[PDB]
Design a protein around this ligand. Structure first.
Ligand SMILES: O=P(O)(O)OC[C@H]1O[C@H](OP(=O)(O)OP(=O)(O)O)[C@H](O)[C@@H]1O
Ligand SMILES: O=P(O)(O)OC[C@H]1O[C@H](OP(=O)(O)OP(=O)(O)O)[C@H](O)[C@@H]1O
Ligand SMILES: [Mg+2]
Ligand SMILES: [Mg+2]
Lengths: 346, 346
């Protein structure tokens, strides 16, 4: 195959043949692709409308080039809590906060992330400011996970071959199909997760990729455009279980959640967002907390769905019970401190 | 305006705002665009179907950075004979053949061109293979048009700022909206022409750009896929006249043209394309001659179209009759030779 062959086809508004997206991404990962070819491919693939197979081959190749974690160090039931980003809105780090709470409820967590692309502080940014280390390689992410209950995979450190593509996509400035990869390329390959998507027309495609692996994942998009489960309004959820997707709308009001204004969830620089995490874990009641509990519940229901013998509602109310208890007992706050303390000790 | 604004809008399948296409082009020409941005723009402008205004803006910006010809050196009734190519044939043998016939019939021709991408011989290549100096500055092109009756503007010499876009578009290696520009960025700004386009949908767009200029133009797509008037079957013509456009069907059988086969008309190697020209200008009667004569008449008919008193069928017979004569008298063969001598006498 070739670039004009592949680019020609996409610009003809045609789905690619099996293996074509993989060859293209492999060319990219292996540094054999000129910056203009990367850009054309990325834009062309977005405007055509990508398929699950296509994006699955993109994520597949990427993973196959990624640093893996050591064998028998990632639990069978580990969850991820990560979004695509591209909110447009500049919220406090909801995914990061819920991750800590989830791990504090004793659900193993291997989080993928990096810095903000558009926002003032990313997950990795906010974690850095807290004094939790985001540099850790495969072996120490494995250690951290077993020793603290949570581990953090920093995307650049696990995905060096993405460097070629990453610079190019920054220059473009528009989001593309590539903005989907982060959540689909966690190097630990955890089989569950809560997965945020800022682009409502692409979210089904992510769900499609997760269903191919037979993951238990809720792909989420707030109807306010949030790549999290919102408290402002309702959220659309593509539930991924048993290798099939199904669409839902989710209403916090049915679990007694006060509706909220978007700007109550608004965020700032790293220090500020790190202050917000200390606040919430510390027990500050209000909008931000509600948001964190909600999403933390979400991930826990995805965990629960690893088992086929599971109903939606009883699992959500268990989830909300546990996220809330994880904060209120101080266990969440403990865990963060335990985790910082882990990093300062090789 | 902005790159992210313009690229995002395109990726939403939205037509641009008045001025944006121009701003994008203007950044490219000025050197203010990343190759990643050039690539995203060219791909997206294509997949979202481009409009006449958008392409006019791109053409206009390009023309406003170009070296013009000296004042009062291009006659008001000058014509261009040219195709988009990318027919995948090629047509270069036909366009340069008709161009010379036309000039030889006493219609000033100023052609715009480049060395080929897809085919072995292209407009400039074939010209260069016949001994013609294709790379002359504005003054010498005017002197050529004055003395020889034809001039060729070499797109690299006349559009220095376009260098960036060309390098980028070579790498993506597939047709984009930028492939319509050549015919619409003649530095000599000639107000008539026969304009071949391999893209049916884009032809109508090119036509509307020429309508905006009040040029008298026949945009032509061979219904056999050719970017010239074919003799293989019927053609589609977009008659541009009085700032308006009429889509037509054209059949050369109504002038006694035998149906040829597509593989008797196809351009080839530059050294081959050259010999074919000597062959046919020397008097080689056949299906190549036929189709040169046809396209040459189209060019002359287009020239006739500058007067609103011009009528269609008589214009075509005067056209056919004059092109035939230019060949048979040897005026055309003789014109090629004076054009070659001209270059050798500077
Ligand atoms: O910067 P953007 O492209 O707008 O993306 C929004 C943020 O989301 C990502 O983190 P992640 O989703 O892992 O965690 P978060 O939701 O807690 O930030 C990333 O780190 C960004 O800072
Ligand atoms: O890009 P390609 O597909 O190789 O096209 C071959 C040639 O056709 C065009 O020139 P010209 O208009 O002189 O020839 P045509 O009008 O017959 O296409 C184009 O500028 C090339 O020189
Ligand atoms: Mg998120
Ligand atoms: Mg977010």
């Amino acid at each position: 195959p070739s670039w004009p062959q592949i680019l020609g086809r996409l610009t003809d508004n045609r789905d690619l043949a099996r293996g074509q997206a993989a060859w293209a991404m492999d060319q990219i990962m292996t540094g054999n692709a000129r910056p203009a070819q990367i850009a054309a491919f990325a834009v062309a693939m977005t405007m055509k409308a990508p398929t699950a197979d296509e994006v699955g081959e993109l994520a597949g190749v990427m993973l196959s080039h990624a640093h893996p974690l050591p064998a028998d160090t990632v639990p069978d039931d580990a969850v991820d809590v990560v979004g695509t980003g591209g909110d447009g809105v500049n919220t406090v780090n909801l995914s990061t906060m819920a991750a800590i709470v989830v791990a504090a409820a004793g659900v193993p967590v291997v989080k993928h992330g990096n810095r903000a692309a558009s926002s003032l502080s990313g997950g990795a940014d906010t974690l850095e400011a807290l004094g939790v280390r985001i540099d850790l390689g495969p072996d120490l992410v494995a250690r951290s996970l077993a020793e603290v209950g949570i581990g953090f995979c920093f995307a650049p450190r696990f995905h060096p071959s993405y460097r070629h593509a990453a610079a190019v996509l920054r220059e473009i400035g528009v989001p593309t199909v590539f903005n989907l990869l982060g959540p689909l390329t966690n190097p630990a390959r955890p089989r569950a997760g809560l997965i945020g998507c800022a682009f409502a027309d692409l979210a089904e495609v992510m769900a499609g990729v997760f269903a191919a692996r037979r993951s238990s994942v809720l792909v989420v998009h707030g109807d306010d455009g949030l790549d999290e489960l919102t408290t402002t309004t309702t959220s659309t959820i593509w539930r991924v279980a048993a290798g099939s997707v199904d669409k839902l709308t989710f209403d916090p009001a049915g679990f007694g959640f006060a509706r909220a204004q978007l700007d109550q969830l608004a965020g700032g620089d790293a220090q500020a967002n790190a202050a917000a995490v200390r606040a919430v874990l510390g027990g500050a009641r209000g909008p931000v907390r509600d948001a964190v509990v909600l999403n933390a519940a979400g991930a826990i229901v995805a965990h629960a769905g690893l088992s086929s013998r599971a109903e939606w509602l009883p699992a959500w109310e268990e989830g909300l019970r546990r996220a809330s208890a994880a904060i209120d007992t101080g266990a969440a706050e403990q865990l963060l401190a335990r985790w910082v303390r882990f990093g300062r000790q090789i």
